[PDB]
Design a protein around this ligand. Structure first.
Ligand SMILES: *[B@@]1([O])OC2=C(C([O])=O)[C]=[C][C]=C2[C][C]1[N]C(=O)[C][C]1[C][C][C]([N][C][C][N])[C][C]1
Length: 356
């Protein structure tokens, strides 16, 4: 307990001072035991302290939840990864999505869908439909990875359509309950708002995420360190869940291609373990520009001596999740500042190394 807190303090405290992080929550799953380390302030203005129940925006860590709902649709044979995208939304039939697979959308290889929807696209069903209807690939589907909200957002929306209900309803009514997540929200209840940390940007501008097209699919989850560790433990032990949910989690542990040291799954990104900190930082700090992929001859099991991870950022928050299946080791780092991905990995690496 002294060694473990000293290890986590040594990793966290300098990174919080260097990046002026007001509050940070750590959760570690070690050999099936949870450990929580809470630092600093959820809100500077009233001095509310971070706890393991504080809600943080996890940004693009939401994509691993989106991938899990798609895994659930696969498990129920409502869809297949080699389906043409437009088979799941009649509004897209006759568009370029006639020639793009669900796997291409899930893995950012549809042919140049951008990082974000253009500002001209509001959170509006018609605007989003018309955006996709008019879109044309810049390059061949299946050839270049460009990290993209509209890409995996559409994957998530099409998975929900395949299940016959809206995305946000499936998450609240089926997925969060199935995984035992009662402190995980797309739309934070009025009664839980007291737990919602403040985000801090430039000059400590207060920042909580506003509405955007396919926000729920791309970046919309708010959760606690305790709940996000529950999600990690479900990923470490899919076999403990009812069969369809065990399968949905397994679908997110399959690699399709490599870019540098990274193997791309559905939501999760994987590295061999051990690997240098510099390489794990570089993987998580990629130039937001297109990368040629190396396609695997068959989908690869993402298990054993590998680190699976995901970064997530909003204007006010910075999240990182990592787990090593072969070591039954999981960690969550949630902060209320969008501090650099390399600094998030720096904390995590110090902890995971400390425990190897
Ligand atoms: B997501 O968090 O992944 C991501 C990272 C990362 O992996 O850490 C870094 C940089 C960008 C992204 C994209 C994802 N996050 C967002 O899209 C943030 C979101 C974008 C829309 C904003 N509101 C628009 C204003 N009308 C809010 C922040």
């Amino acid at each position: 307990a002294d060694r473990l807190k000293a290890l986590v303090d040594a990793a966290v405290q300098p990174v919080m001072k260097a990046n002026d992080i007001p509050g940070l929550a750590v959760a570690i799953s070690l050999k099936g035991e949870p450990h929580y380390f809470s630092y600093g302030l959820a809100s500077k203005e009233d001095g509310r302290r971070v706890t393991p129940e504080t809600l943080f925006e996890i940004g693009s860590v939401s994509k691993t939840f989106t991938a899990t709902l798609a895994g659930y649709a696969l498990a129920q044979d409502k869809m297949r990864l080699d389906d043409r995208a437009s088979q799941h939304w009649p509004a897209l039939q006759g568009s370029r999505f006639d020639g793009i697979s669900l796997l291409d959308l899930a893995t950012y290889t549809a042919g140049g869908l951008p990082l974000q929807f253009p500002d001209s696209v509001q959170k509006d069903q018609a605007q989003i439909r018309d955006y996709y209807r008019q879109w044309q690939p810049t390059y061949a589907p299946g050839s270049q990875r460009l990290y993209s909200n509209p890409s995996i957002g559409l994957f998530g929306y099409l998975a929900a359509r395949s299940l016959g209900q809206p995305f946000e309803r499936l998450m609240e009514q089926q997925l969060f309950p199935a995984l035992g997540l009662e402190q995980t929200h797309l739309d934070v209840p009025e009664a839980a708002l007291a737990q919602y940390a403040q985000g801090y940007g430039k000059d400590d501008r207060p920042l909580r995420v506003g509405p955007g097209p396919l926000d729920a699919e791309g970046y919309g989850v708010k959760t606690s360190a305790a709940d996000l560790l529950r999600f990690v433990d479900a990923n470490l032990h899919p076999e403990r869940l009812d069969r369809p949910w065990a399968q949905a989690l397994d679908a997110t542990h399959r690699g399709y291609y490599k870019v540098g040291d990274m193997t791309q799954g559905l939501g999760w990104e994987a590295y061999d373990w051990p690997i240098s900190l510099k390489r794990l930082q570089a993987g998580n700090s990629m130039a937001l520009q297109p990368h040629r992929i190396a396609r695997l001859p068959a989908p690869q099991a993402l298990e054993g001596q590998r680190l699976l991870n995901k970064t997530g950022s909003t204007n006010g928050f910075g999240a990182y999740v990592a787990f090593i299946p072969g070591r039954d080791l999981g960690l969550v780092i949630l902060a209320n500042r969008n501090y650099p991905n390399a600094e998030r990995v720096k904390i995590a690496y110090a902890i995971l190394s400390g425990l190897e």
